[PDB]
């Protein structure tokens, strides 16, 4: 107890934070581990995802070695300022924090051989590019890039501790709309003309679940188009009925397209859902134009030929359009 206190005092005495371990020696090797609690949210509008996690950095330092105390020491969180820590930052971070209730989620653990382990609970809102061109049938690939700020590869070398076992909690992630297909870890050195800087990267591939979209966005449009096709089987002189059917189908299509504001209106890009809705709109418009032709040709100046070929060509053309769309986008 007392001798433990004097051991800690001797360890911290004459230890300059401004000096890295082996200032003139070979570079210090930092092993990084992550235990990710969950990915809290993924927003396409702001183009980013929120990740909470336990970042651990492990490194050796001869200055902080002790002896005669075989048990492993876990010092208080207030020693972080007293001890030197590597400068590490997330390149694609927009806003992150270290939890601070009831106390700061920060741990420093020393070992008798001078080794140090530093752990932090961080919630980072990292930013990842998204290709919402194939939305909602897309498959995003988001990344977290860890990099040293001041030091080059000649002074600090980042690596994954445990190879492919560095990152854990992918099973623990549970996103409502997305589903994780694969995760990857890549360590490398970004090469600059001035020098080389180390970098690590943890990447996730996130497929999107399409059952919800197929139920809400796609199915009503198909049903409305099929309803618009009903006009061809009604008597050609039923002007009020056929015109009301066609124009109300057009109105329903427009109503769906406008209150579809849930599906990414705030940021505007041409996605795949937009093309599908446009195709359905064009089909119902052509359906009404067909009765326009029928009325003018046959009423003014034994089924009529226009309806006869329309009944066969409208479903066939819509099926071909659907086949082309699904094959191209999948």
């Amino acid at each position, epitope marked *: 107890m007392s001798f433990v206190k004097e051991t800690v005092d001797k360890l911290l005495k004459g230890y300059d934070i401004r000096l890295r371990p082996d200032f003139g020696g070979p570079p210090v090797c930092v092993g990084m581990n992550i*235990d990710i609690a969950s990915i809290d949210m993924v927003s396409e509008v702001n183009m980013d995802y929120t990740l909470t996690m336990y970042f651990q950095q492990y490194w050796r330092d001869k200055r902080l070695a002790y002896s005669g105390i075989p048990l492993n020491l876990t010092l208080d969180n207030r020693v972080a300022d007293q001890l030197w820590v590597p400068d590490t930052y997330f390149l694609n971070d927009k806003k992150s924090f270290v939890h601070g209730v009831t106390v700061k989620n920060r741990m420093i653990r020393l070992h008798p051989d001078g080794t140090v382990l530093y752990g932090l609970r961080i919630t980072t809102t990292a930013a990842c590019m998204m290709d919402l061109r194939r939305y909602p049938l897309d498959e995003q690939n988001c990344t977290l890039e860890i990099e040293s700020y001041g030091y080059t590869t000649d002074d600090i070398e980042f690596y994954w501790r445990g190879g492919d076992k560095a990152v*854990t909690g*992918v*099973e*623990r*992630i*549970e*996103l409502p709309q997305f*589903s*994780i*297909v694969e995760h990857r870890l890549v360590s490398r050195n970004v090469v600059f003309a001035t020098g080389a800087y180390p970098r690590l990267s943890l990447s996730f591939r996130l497929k999107r679940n399409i059952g919800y979209f197929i139920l809400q966005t796609y199915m009503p449009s198909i049903l409305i188009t099929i309803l618009s096709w009903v006009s061809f089987w009604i008597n050609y002189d039923a002007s009020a009925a056929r015109v009301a059917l066609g124009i109300t189908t057009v109105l329903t299509m427009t109503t769906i397209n406008t209150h579809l504001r849930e599906t990414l209106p705030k940021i505007p890009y041409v996605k795949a859902i937009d093309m599908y809705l446009m195709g359905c709109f064009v089909f119902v418009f052509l359906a009404l134009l067909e009765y326009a032709f029928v009325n003018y040709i046959f009423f003014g100046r034994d089924v009529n030929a226009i309806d006869r070929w329309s009944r066969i060509v409208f479903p066939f053309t819509f099926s071909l359009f659907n086949l082309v769309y699904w094959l191209y986008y999948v």
Partner: nanobody
Amino acid sequence: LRLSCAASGHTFNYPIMGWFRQAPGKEREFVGAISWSGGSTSYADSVKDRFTISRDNAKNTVYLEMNNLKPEDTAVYYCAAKGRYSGGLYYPTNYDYWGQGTQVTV
């Protein structure tokens, strides 16, 4: 060989489910775990690429596929489920509800 572990009850509260094996005169050792949603699984290095785990959204739930029978596979295999926040896949003590042992002696 194909194994199937069917779960009934409040299965959402116990998302991650995995497999353990106990040889005679030995402790239970981890064999592979699978998450609740879709394909997100982990396997032990000692038995990688010879045991595979898949999931179905049904009461039958998870399936396991076995290859390369060996004298080190003479162990009874238990199916277990874990709480959402009970960290540690490889440790049996973190798991609450267990199945039974199926001897796979060569």
